[PDB]
Design an enzyme around this catalytic site. Structure first.
Site, PDB file in Angstrom:
ATOM      1  N   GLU A   1     -15.854 -21.898  43.816  1.00  0.00           N
ATOM      2  CA  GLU A   1     -14.841 -22.165  44.844  1.00  0.00           C
ATOM      3  C   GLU A   1     -15.023 -23.506  45.553  1.00  0.00           C
ATOM      4  OE1 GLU A   1     -12.245 -20.396  45.108  1.00  0.00           O
ATOM      5  OE2 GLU A   1     -12.716 -18.368  44.418  1.00  0.00           O
TER       6      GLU A   1
ATOM      7  N   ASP B   1      -5.170 -24.326  47.111  1.00  0.00           N
ATOM      8  CA  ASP B   1      -5.995 -23.831  46.019  1.00  0.00           C
ATOM      9  C   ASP B   1      -5.293 -24.104  44.695  1.00  0.00           C
ATOM     10  OD1 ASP B   1      -4.046 -21.863  45.654  1.00  0.00           O
ATOM     11  OD2 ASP B   1      -5.348 -20.186  46.184  1.00  0.00           O
TER      12      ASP B   1
END
Ligand SMILES: CCCCc1ccccc1
Length: 164
Positions: free
Chosen positions: A11, A20
């Protein structure tokens, strides 16, 4: 290696609101803020999550706190899911990390279509599960990460993460 190190690799860490891979406002270590296209909505969600007026920026400690909460939520979600819990309980420690990783990324609705893969994992048919897992939007949209997670399921080792 542990689930925190694994997800930190997958991440990353960003202290300002970002989008994202799916275009959703996110912050920290993959903490989804909202699926709304409104940055203002995301900023509100951030202030609510952190408990202060952040103006779209947080500290590393704050990011790590959200991360702890999110990992815990992912695991508890698995244990509360009647489909996921038995498979999770059947797995070894390393493979449990792969499971948490997937739920962290896609939630429980997002893994809903993985019935066949779940069966193969429960049966410890690792190569078969690995092949099945790659037949997914998940694999096609984030192939590098999916390959790492799948390798973890296939081998029960951290080989895919050792060269970060
Ligand atoms: C592949 C199904 C979603 C990830 C998962 C795998 C095993 C146990 C719980 C969760």
């Amino acid at each position: 290696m542990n689930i925190f190190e694994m997800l930190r690799i997958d991440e990353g860490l960003r202290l300002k609101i970002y989008k994202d891979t799916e275009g959703y406002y996110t912050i920290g270590i993959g903490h989804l803020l909202t699926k709304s296209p409104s940055l203002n909505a995301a900023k509100s969600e951030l202030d609510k999550a952190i408990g202060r007026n952040c103006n779209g920026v947080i500290t590393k400690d704050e990011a790590e706190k959200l991360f702890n909460q999110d990992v815990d939520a992912a695991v508890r979600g698995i244990l509360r899911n009647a489909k996921l819990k038995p498979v999770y309980d059947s797995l070894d420690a390393v493979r449990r990390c792969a499971a948490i990783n997937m739920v962290f990324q896609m939630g429980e609705t997002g893994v809903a279509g993985f019935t066949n893969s779940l069966r193969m994992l429960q049966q410890k048919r690792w190569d078969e599960a690995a092949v099945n897992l790659a037949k997914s939007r998940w694999y096609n949209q984030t192939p590098n990460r999916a390959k790492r997670v799948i390798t973890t399921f296939r081998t029960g080792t951290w080989d895919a993460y050792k060269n970060l």
